[PDB]
């Protein structure tokens, strides 16, 4: 997208969201990142929403095909599952590449750095969901390491109700439960996060209260299912 203006790529990403054209949205936001400038809060959210939709569709498809393939055990189901898996891995590698070149290294504020490291944990987590080979343990550790650095910054630099801090803790708890086979760590993280947020709600405006309590409810929903 090298010939399109940065501002035009951002505008088109917003239009693509309205049109539910998420592959386009992701391509526009990739182009915007490759302009080399840091991203504002709104622009980071556009990048994240675009790729979460793209990879979300791939993950749903991979799960359908993996289920059919497990029940089957011709080559067609495995071949097609492998095709979808390779496309998913390609998208995760693209996002991880944007974070490494060069979003994270230029992110100095806690809000941007935590945001990108949470992304890095999520996309390694999506790689781990499909991994089976010599590097599967290394993929899991890469997710853990990214989430852990994000957690360390967020506890030092953000209030316990900050929505990015809350969503990071939610996703790290899912990592523990679903990927790392650590359900007790998942439950403890979700409970401690919820309780520390509850105790900080009194400091918030009405709008911030709504933002924080929405994610707190997601923490409670997981706790209900896990306990």
């Amino acid at each position: 997208m090298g010939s399109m203006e940065r501002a035009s790529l951002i505008q088109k990403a917003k239009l693509a969201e309205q049109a539910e054209r998420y592959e386009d949205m992701a391509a526009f936001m990739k182009g915007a990142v490759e302009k080399g400038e840091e991203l504002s809060c709104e622009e980071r959210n556009l990048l994240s929403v675009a790729y979460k939709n793209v990879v979300g569709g791939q993950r749903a498809a991979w799960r359908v095909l993996s289920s059919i393939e497990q029940k089957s055990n011709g080559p067609e189901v495995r071949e097609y599952r492998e095709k979808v898996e390779t496309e998913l891995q390609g998208v995760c590698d693209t996002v991880l590449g944007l974070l490494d070149s060069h979003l994270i290294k230029e992110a100095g504020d806690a809000e941007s750095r935590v945001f990108y490291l949470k992304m890095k944990g999520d996309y390694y987590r999506y790689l781990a969901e499909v991994a089976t080979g010599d590097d599967k343990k290394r993929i899991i550790d890469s997710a853990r390491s990214a989430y852990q650095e994000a957690m360390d910054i967020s506890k030092k630099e953000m209030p316990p109700t900050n929505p990015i801090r809350l969503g990071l803790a939610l996703n790290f708890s899912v990592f523990h439960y679903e990927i790392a086979n650590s359900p007790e760590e998942a439950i403890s993280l979700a409970k401690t996060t919820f309780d520390e947020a509850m105790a900080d709600l009194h400091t918030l405006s009405e709008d911030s209260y709504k933002d924080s309590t929405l994610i707190m409810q997601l923490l409670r929903d997981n706790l209900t299912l896990w306990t």
Partner: peptide
């Protein structure tokens, strides 16, 4: 177990 949906800006 639900992660952040994260699919609407």
């Amino acid at each position: 177990a639900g992660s952040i949906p994260g699919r609407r800006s």
